From a paper:
determined the three-dimensional structures of these four agarases. initiated by GH86 or GH16B, which generates NAOS. depolymerized by GH86, and systematically saccharified by the exo-acting GH117B and GH2C enzymes. exo-acting β-d-galactosidases, while GH117A and GH117B are α-1,3-L-neoagarooligosaccharide hydrolases.
replaced with W657 and C598 in GH2C, respectively.
Author numbering: 46 to 92, 104 to 533, 542 to 586, 607 to 686, 694 to 847
Write the structure that this text describes.
Amino acid sequence: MASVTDGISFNENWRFFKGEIKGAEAISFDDDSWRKLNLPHDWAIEGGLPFHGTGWYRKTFIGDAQWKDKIVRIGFDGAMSEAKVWINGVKVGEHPYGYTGFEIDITKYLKIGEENVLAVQLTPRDLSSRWYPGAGIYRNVWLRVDNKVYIPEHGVYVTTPTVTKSKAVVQIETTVKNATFGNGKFNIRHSIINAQGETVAILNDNVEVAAGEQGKTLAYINMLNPNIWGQKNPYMYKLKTEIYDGKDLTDTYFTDFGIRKICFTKDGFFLNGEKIRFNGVCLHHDNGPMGAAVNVRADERKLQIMKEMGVNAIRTSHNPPSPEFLDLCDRMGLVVLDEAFDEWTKAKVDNGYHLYFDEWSKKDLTSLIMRDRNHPSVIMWSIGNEILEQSDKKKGFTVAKYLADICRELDPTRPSTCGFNYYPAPFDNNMAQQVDIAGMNYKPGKYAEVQRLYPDLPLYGSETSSCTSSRGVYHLPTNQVTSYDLIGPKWAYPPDIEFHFQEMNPRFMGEFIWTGFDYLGESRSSYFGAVDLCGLPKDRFYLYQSQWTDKPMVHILPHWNWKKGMNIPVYVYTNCYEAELFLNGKSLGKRVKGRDLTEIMVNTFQSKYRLSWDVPFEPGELTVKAYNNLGELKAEKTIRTAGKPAQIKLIPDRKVITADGKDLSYITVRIEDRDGNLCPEADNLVEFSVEGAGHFRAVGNGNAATTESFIEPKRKAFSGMCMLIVQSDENKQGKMNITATSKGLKTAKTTINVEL
């Protein structure tokens, strides 16, 4: 029956056509020549890069007999953008904003036994995004077959209004729709299920709902010795909510949730009774070579890499993310600023959200909070970013309030926030006061002043640094940017400056850097990421890791393929007390952090966050030793001058992947000399073959200025490396054999095993 099922995938077996064709909405339209594919799908990754035009999707399906007299809905988590949707030729849906999901009820129009046709037209416009949006049904689609008494979309809201070590209270609001002709009282059974799948608590409730109406009800249950959700231990519970009409089960509905408390004052943010600080990153929703199509593993990898950098917090610049991304943040212990919009009523781009803000702002923000208010990862609702209303002196604040009031109406359990780039406008124009917590974009030099002027505002750096670099590229002394991390736009400054102004202003909750990963644009890709587009750390990663992690480390830059005669400035990043540099054995001296300052060129800053030597380049090896204040060795790294490119090495991040059709292995591709040393500048075209249990998916190298295809089985190295991405086939177990080939280098092989 429909009573057991929450919502099943409707991603399989679609037809796609890029371009305008008239009559594609209809039941009788020949689509035998249309490309066949499974969702999710981003046609713009080809398939900055062109993201506008027209796309059609079609799916044909028999009305299953089990759907007779059922409520049937198709849930779309995201469609980019300007979507129209038909069932059996009848237009039943229209949705402009690509980042909020929507439902279409096809019940009235569904034909049981005969064929049905679901058509979706997307008409994304040019100049509708300042970053790469992608284009298509880039997020999962769901079929929802329900009995006539059921829980509608986003119909369970779980809060924890007491959280203590001895006891937490889990409060649950349930919404029930009555689509029968009869008034009824319906029983509700909440089963709270732990990490091992065992039901540990059950809460009963009920609700009277009249015919054709919707009803809500609230109950709470005690959890003794709760497993607290926290950053080191991100324990998740699961809620099974069952609806009953007398003895008959009518519906089942699942909700993941965590048990943690949050709290803020003007002096900071609090998680489970302790000062928390945001070592944060802004990320855009694309996964580079993988595009904007939702891939769970792609996101998992990105968030793991960010955690290794010391990241504990995410700002979803500048839109809602996928549920999958937030589920990952939940399971990985990251706290999230969940951001709804980039512009309000005043336009930043000709075809941005301002075209829809008047008619859609309340719907879309409501939809966001309804979708995400159960995620324990989400700690703030951010209403906007760098909005032009900041400079409307008389009335800009009204729009901020309006969105802020909506947040408070729907979820007072999390504070509102907003990213402000003007200064002092939004603080002087009563705007910053309309949200619970104010975020400054790129104003470390003003942190002290704004606290003098507005001492009752809670504050954090909503968007910081904007330093640019290209991985493993140094200019001594262009088309790429120096990985010595000095250059950026006019408002930009190096990470050292944020660190300095964070330490001087402890009331600031933290920073969210622009950006954690590189992202796709409209040079088609960004330079702002601490990690590059394909997931390879730049030196900036290590700078951040030196500041944000306890596990001892040390990093040395630049590479050591230079010309004899040159003075190379050598930088070292470490969380240790001091470090010592060694060229071929010769000690080039100690250097203590917070004492032997490095002069960064912005006017120029004496930085305590870097250790520096001036080295005359003799080739061979350069080794750095990091020590604690007792002189004990705690970390070391060794770089050496590599010779001519001789051989390809392949390093999978994972040698076993799930046989689900979606999971990936990210194989780092290294261009090495005869003795195994990375050739730090190699750009050799590498070709790839994938045989057996899976296929070639994608490829990439973190170069922003290239024009190479992400989806052809060929890619050039950039600064010694590139990345090959491979994927399982659904239900196909066994070995998957990768061969990597390049003109004049030793061929490389590796096996990826595929299970489940």
